[PDB]
Amino acid sequence: ATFEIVNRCSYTVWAAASKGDAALDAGGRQLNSGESWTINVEPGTNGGKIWARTDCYFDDSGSGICKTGDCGGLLRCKRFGRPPTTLAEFSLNQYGKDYIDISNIKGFNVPMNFSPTTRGCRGVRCAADIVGQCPAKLKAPGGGCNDACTVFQTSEYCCTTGKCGPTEYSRFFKRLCPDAFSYVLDKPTTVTCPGSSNYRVTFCPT
């Protein structure tokens, strides 16, 4: 599958793509304002994620740090990023279908649209000013809006037992972005697409 990753933000982002124990394609790249990066994701990829990283500093070997979404200090991500990260999530060619969603379960840093570029399904978007509106206790001093599990580490926020409900904090994300997951057991907002669809992830879509 092809993913076109497009930065419409006025600021540079460092895109990242991983399935948690491996990079997808090159794993990461700088995207200046307006730039597009096309990656190839292996068919059958289960639990893939794409995100933006902000305020990164890398040396000549691709080692450094990002203020949001850092993946063990690498330009080319092999692992998932440090919250807060708005997440484009996908599992491809799962019994003949693709499954896509946006998640705020690991917080929010950059607004994003995640849409198919091929026929047969719809896209999802979380484009509200979640950082600007972020509850005081969730504001990441490094930048972005943390999820409550990251901040408070409770069974209720982290859904440790598999029995959690919505919270004041999850309802904040849900109110601003109804089409993204706000907590682990949220009513699913997953879109079913034809197997082997292609996609575009757009940062700052509005």
User: What is the CATH number for 205?
Assistant: 2.60.110.10
Residues 72/56, Cβ–Cβ less than 8 Å: no
Question: Which approach determined this entry?
Answer: X-ray
Residue 135: name the closest of 86, 170, 110 by CA: 170
d(C-alpha 67, C-alpha 59), whole Å:
15
φ/ψ of 89, rounded to 5, equals -120, 140
For residue 92 the two structure tokens come to 């491809």
Resolution in A: 1.5
Question: Could you give the count of Cα atoms lying within 13 Å of 123 in the half-sphere of its Cβ?
Answer: 17
- 10: number of Cβ within 10 Å: 8
Residues 126/104, Cβ–Cβ less than 8 Å: yes
DSSP 8-state code for residue 86? -
Residues 49/87, Cβ–Cβ less than 8 Å: yes
d(C-alpha 37, C-alpha 29), whole Å:
8
Residue 206 structural domain = 1-206
For residue 9 the two structure tokens come to 């933000």
For residue 194 the two structure tokens come to 């034809």
How many helices and strands, by DSSP H and E, does the chain display?
4, 13
φ/ψ of 72, rounded to 5, equals 55, 35
- 104: number of Cβ within 10 Å: 25
Number of domains in the chain: 1
Beta strand 64-68 pairing with 23-31: unpaired
For residue 144 the two structure tokens come to 């972005």
CA–CA distance from 50 to each of 70, 73, 184 (Å)? 13, 17, 18
